[model samples]
Target chain A: HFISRRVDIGRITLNVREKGSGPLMLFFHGITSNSAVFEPLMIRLSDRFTTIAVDQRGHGLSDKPETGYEANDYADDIAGLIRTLARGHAILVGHSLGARNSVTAAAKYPDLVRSVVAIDFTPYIETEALDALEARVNAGSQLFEDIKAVEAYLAGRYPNIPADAIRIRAESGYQPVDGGLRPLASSAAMAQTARGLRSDLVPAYRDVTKPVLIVRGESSKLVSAAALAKTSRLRPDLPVVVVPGADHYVNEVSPEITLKAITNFIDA
Target chain B: HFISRRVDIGRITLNVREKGSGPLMLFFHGITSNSAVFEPLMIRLSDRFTTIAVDQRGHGLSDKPETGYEANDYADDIAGLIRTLARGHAILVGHSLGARNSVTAAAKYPDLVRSVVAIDFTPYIETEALDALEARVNAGSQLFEDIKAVEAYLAGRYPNIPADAIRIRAESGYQPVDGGLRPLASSAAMAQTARGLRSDLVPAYRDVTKPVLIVRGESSKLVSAAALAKTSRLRPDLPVVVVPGADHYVNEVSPEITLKAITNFIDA
Candidate 1:
């Protein structure tokens, strides 16, 4: 069943896309992106697992509420979706910001989670790491001349990305206002939300008694080998698969490796 | 150095255990228990990591102020501990209630956590599964006239367990009061804490993006294999390891296996 449901979560109504069948698997997208980020993984994994992807609360097709951007709030939405949709249990897969949301959900509700797959995200990142990127989409309230301008700016910013992927990210990243296109996720909110981005997860990692699989891009600046090594120590049995020749946008650049690593781990 | 410190948290002062050197590793014990439950693991890991086995608020040496038994409250206390101790990041290992608290800490402050290791716990347990065990514990509670009576009851209940293990559980499980003794953690508190145990970790887990290891006892009836499998699907590379011939207390029954798994995983 392909569902475009609006779940009334408190005062916010979120747009959710749910499709396929078998064991339920929910996909969450990253910051400045939407559920469409998983378009590649969805196309592949949907055949075997019931895949449900959400636009998150403030991004993509979901309603843009003025507040509540904490990672915990996002986790609540995933938990609600699982309660409403899944049968026995659901597997959660996320990338970047979505990966953070997946971690929160699985750690909070281990019963509903069948397993988790985090893509190319480390708990911490250095500012110098992001210097290579030219176009910066200020998550903080930024004004744009027009929707066309915003789209053009985004295109110019991410020139190397394929047109379709860029479009998907832009659509999810901005909201159409009366005068022009404004960022859906506020900059202040983003700053507040991103405050602890570089923090550690060892304390919480200990309490997670679930099976996990971490996938990283070899060329990604967001995660360092040191971070990965430190994390492996926390949960030694879990395998960390690195996709060579892939950058921070590994899911987009190398979906095959990501999907293969994920499917094989889940199947195992 | 062994030291006991009390810090003002909200309106209450919480008792904390401080010892050893290196990165801090806080230990959280189960319900009706205290920090001493970690004595075995603390002695083993203290040389490598600074260990702080806290008496959670309302448990052990901590002040049992009225109200504030929510999971968030416990998480806040842990965060407060890190801030007070000036330990930037630390590994958190929690057993049962401590496990829940540890997860909450990671969720609330992803930055303060280095990693987490949850032992023999799942987000939810079936009511039917609790029936036989609940009946036995309730019966034992009613029959026990004193601490000795409780010990005798436990001996009979777990005849296969070594006498020392039963004694340790009893010592940590009970409190000496003017009138005989009472279970250190109130049944009402346990029930309330149980309600707080609802599955809510997906977003927190997703946001974690850290390496997590979940250790379970092969012979334990608490955490199911299906639940472990479900957890792996939630995160890409979080691994679950089970210690053979061990019960709910894998760290206690098979400390060597637990240590070996942890050492190898950390080294890998």
Candidate 2:
């Protein structure tokens, strides 16, 4: 069943999907993405991990405040959500911005975050890639004439993404505005959150003395080879793995391998 | 005369203080603290730079939204303020949480932020130090019988702080609640924003490729020494300097040296 609910943790309310009954495993999605992206992944692991995914502060059906999109802000929302919804102890698995926030939540709230599996996106994204990505992201905020346009644009950009998947999530993620369909996600939120990707994430890697894992797409445009090796090799605690054929949106583009990697880490 | 004004930037109407002129120099205060603390520092630097400091989102005279206390949220507010006030470019200076937000602002909105000077705090504060700080901070939400009690408590906690200073700011920073007085600042904002101080600030340094200077009080108990050195080494652009005989409130205790460090960096 595709089931979820909203829980307001003060600053903003989040759309959360829950299933199964076991130790808590909280899911956080990347920027402009949502818990819906984890639907397939949740089904795969919910029976074992008590998996619940959340639409972060700004994205999805969550309340989009004019501000508070920093990585730390996202961590605060998750920490508060855990206390309010989960059992307070959660193993965090995040993709892109979700991964960054999970690293943040794990490091900031050690007691609540048992382990963090940061998938695809990393804290140490290259500047050239980031600046260029930010430009496209800002451009992508344009109001589409219709859902078809959005789907077409998204399909052309990432054709590997399933058509039905784009139609479902894209409709949910956009708003019917004056004469056009504007993205439901805030441009301010997307741009500000992207800025966090560049901040020195070493502390995200270093301070998290808990069980931490970094998963990246083998052909990732967002993460670097030297940086990944350095993050994995330099940090004695963090272990790294790469999906067979995935990019920054590795979780959505390649759910099976991403799910297996996360399951192996959590089960192990 | 030190002049303060409020500018409505849609989401937030900022409480801004401005004096003198040159390149824009913006200021931000830390958690539970207000822009009043920067009066002395402004007196010193206003002559060389057009210094304008703001009471952050949930503190001082600013709008305290029920939520939006995240570092990125705060940074977004600053970015909006800069576009509205400083004409889109400013040398950012922040203390504690303000420092944290400045890093986010610099990283996420690099174009609006010219350079950054972070004082008395870092992204990687020692866990023991933060836990102790959090406990004391959590305890600090207690209502006071009168402003005097608040002043007494603060003066005792920070013996180096002046009585008049404490009295004036405490009277303004707190408000009448029930039969007693509670912090004018939101308790939730205070706690959540402080939690961000523990998240990987390493990203703050890594992403901020701007000419950045980190100032700390040599005797400060918040920032971990190893984290500071490691952050500086990793992000070679960010250079660290210590203010003699200063602690976390280096700018307040040693305003002269703090000013010099900032002046040298901004001037160079």
Candidate 3:
């Protein structure tokens, strides 16, 4: 079980789920997702790792300013959190937007971040993938009658994600509104976050001189083979693991394999 | 007289002109201009400020990487320089490209920056102004027969600038390239730096929760009245000064007036 609490990282207050006790392993979720999305992985790693999954600004219970959805803005939040929470350097594990932020934070705040586990993310995303993401986030912005409706919608949209994961997402990623349930992040906020992704992150990625492990879903539309090849060209020494039969939401779709990749990278 | 030397700011080495002996005051020059352009102001303020005018990467005796011409990249250099040199916080004074970098650095590394004196620059430049800048940089990317030829070209190009200023620009801003002299920065490097200016710096500028004084040349085409008004709307408290009979290169054209504004802001 994880305890959810709001941690003030100076610039903003982020709601994070904490469990276990060891070297800090900070988890950052992607756009339209909340800290609860990483619950399965956090619970499994609780024995050896001190896992803290944060609801990034504009998502879940975190403070969302009107602007500042850029990668650097997100990276700034990560830097502040690391300075406040980590006794020393902390390991960063991020998915999509989170992964981009992880790479950026590592490059900008090298002294604060330890090794990084970037799961299902690259600097360049194809137009089709970006459009799909925007559409999904926009669609999720609408109100749902109840938690069951949200659960049903999630199950239908991402069938590969387990029912348990879908339940957690429906419960933690949405909040009660006057009429029904709305996504934790507003449509406007999510749109700003999406637009911020237009800039290429390759420079920041190349700038990250620290050790990094890239985790990709075999069938992910977001992280294509060409994208992975481009990344490999930048840092041939960096290790990458492809989780078979997984899609963009690799961590939730195949938690066991993703966990195995992380554990192997962490221990070795 | 200021002493010129190379200092490694972690990621890269930048040539800086060091003078005075009081609080740290770092200067960043615009595109196509080197640290020498700020010599007049540095000498005037030397009595009360420890001024260090830096030749930003790709412009002077600094290492120019192929990529990373974004405002964030320039700001990162400032952060590194401030961390390595400053006893506590450093005051940043910049012109054009330097001003944008100052605002960005202030926003990104708040703990390191004290205040900013942004001269003759705005976050948003008009299309015509951007086009003119690109043309100027591209044109300057040619070889001259000798130093005298360079001086003649500069004098004809910017008639408002004083003879001493033109001399400094000619001598310090270019180096020997076989049978002739070329700009310290390469055509490709300058092009990258110019392209970097395409991004809107409004977000970074608005994020700077700091004491900032904006200086504009009264007759400048780059920073329009509307642009300054927009900036005022963002930060009504920020003070602004106009140097009479000056253009985009305000500091060089009217050093005494620019120095007066800076001194007034510094003392106040």
Candidate 4:
């Protein structure tokens, strides 16, 4: 079942969603993505856990308050939802930005959480590495004069994404709706968020004490062997798994492998 | 020194106040109260720490969005303010509703926080205790035949509160236009908040690992000794203190005592 509610935090109202029931499990998606990114995982986990997925601020059906885009702000938004929906406590599972957030939340409120599963992310990636990735991904943000040009541009970059999904992304990701399409996720907003991602996540990671399971995409450049090795030392007992044939969006590309790792960790 | 800014959080714009200069400290006040409630503490600690006090949504200079007033929602607001104003992490201090929110924020995002100080509150207060308090405080919301009548009503309950303070509270606590007066902190909002407070804080408190200081008023009956002991047992290290000459508004009555205990714990 799909459920939606307007949760007021101070003056901003956040739209929250909850589906399925049993033990609570919260799933957070990465930037340029919404709760829908976890559709496959939600379906698989629904039988055993009351799965919840959120559209982080500025990314999903949730109200987009124009300012708070920092990583901590995003993490806090999920944390607030956990406080409201999970009522008791729940296992937190996140991907990319979501992964970092889940770890941050668990570290902050270890009692309100059972455990955490971080997918394809570490607290921080090297600056030079991030810059190269940003340049590659941002190259896609360049403006196209017409629909055909825009579609062609997206086709070249996200060729594997279904045509319908591409259209949805373009539609949801832009703003200033005139007769033609405009990027909903403003370029300034993107730059602001990208700038925020540059901060080192190591110091925060050091404070985390929860039983965490870090899942990395074996083929993804985002989590380098050196970084993963360093992170393991921060909490040596927190298990780490590297999924073969999976890239940054592991759930999208290799859900079976990702699910297997998640189930094992959560069950363990 | 006082600082104010219109920082945007999603679509909501908040006017945040900061005073002082060391590690950031954020403060939240109860219903019908604004950042002004922390004036005494801010004055005392301004030299040792950078202090931030916010007008709860719909109370002071902040935007009054018609929705979003849950404890977790308020926690997100605090989290956003900390990220935007304090940079990343800070110590949080709250009173009543603000106290509930502070704990929630710390529980939700441990890294963005150094510690929390809660005054005269617990996660669950006996419903009877709240009903009695509400019966007394709700007089502030009684329909007054005229402005004079409103002043008369307030004058009776808080005879000691300066007439100006009473006037300010009445005006700040309600919105006045051509329609006369409508309580800004609505009964509906308070009821929802009170119900959640009954069960939210205890469990959330268990998740908190950062040091916590629970300050109570010796004369106030809202928090029983048993409640304090129960919460302290949940996190054995949590420190508890009772101000000798103060009541529920201990921070207002004897800030020096409240601050001495709070600062000691936060600085430790």
Best by DockQ: 1
**TM-score per model over all chains:** 0.50, 0.49, 0.50, 0.46
What are the per-residue Cα lDDT tens digits for candidate 4 across A1-268?
5576667654355655567779888888766666655655687888777887776676656667677677778767766777766467778888887787787777777777777788877865777767865666456455556666666776666555456655645554544344555543444555666667777787667776556667776667677767876776554434456666666666666666677556645542
The most accurate candidate by lDDT is: 3
Error of 1 at A109 (Å): 41
| Model 2: per-residue Cα lDDT over A1-268, one tens digit each | 7577888887678888889878898888767767777777788876766889898877878887887777789889988988887475898888778888888888888888777878766655678988977877777788788888888988786666777667766767788999788877778989888776677787767776566667777678778766675664445224445564567777777776566556534532
Q: Which digits, one per residue and each the tens of the lDDT, describe model 1 over residues A1-268?
A: 4567777655467777767778888888766666766766787777777787887776766776567677677778778777765376777788877777777777888887877787766554555553322124353256776666766776676555566777766665677787777776655445534543434545445555555667777667777766666666555555567676676777777766577566545643
lDDT of 2 by residue, B63-142 (tens): 88777666678889988988887455888899878888888888888788887888767755668998877777755588
Instruction: Tell me candidate 2's TM-score on chain B.
Output: 0.91
For model 1, the superposed segments whose C-alpha errors exceed 4 Å read A1-268, B124-127, B130-147, B156-162, B266-268
**Of candidates 3 and 2, the better by lDDT:** 3
**Per-residue lDDT for B1-268 in model 4, tens only?**
6777667776466766777788788888876577765766787888978887888675667776656777777888877777766465887888887888888888898888877888888755677877766666555554555566677776776554456655655554556645476565556555555555565577678776565667777666677666765665454334456666566676776655566556435432
DockQ of each: 0.04, 0.01, 0.01, 0.01
Prediction-by-prediction clash tally: 67, 9, 0, 18
lDDT score of residue B156 within candidate 1: 81
State, as a TM-score between 0 and 1, how close model 2 is to the true structure.
0.49
Candidate 3 per-residue lDDT, tens place, A1-268, comes to 8999999989999899999988888999988888988878888888877899999999999998998899989999999998888567888999999998998999899888877888888876677878777777777878899999999898998888889989989989888999999898867789999988767988887788666777778789888978886776565435556666789888888776677556645642
Error of 2 at A216 (Å): 0.9
Candidate 3 lDDT, B49-161, residue by residue in tens: 89999999888888888888889899999999988885678989999899989988998988888788888777667788888888888888788999999999999888888
Model 2, docking class: incorrect
Q: CA lDDT of B152 in candidate 4? A: 74
Question: Of the true interface contacts, what fraction does each candidate have?
Answer: 0.06, 0.00, 0.00, 0.00
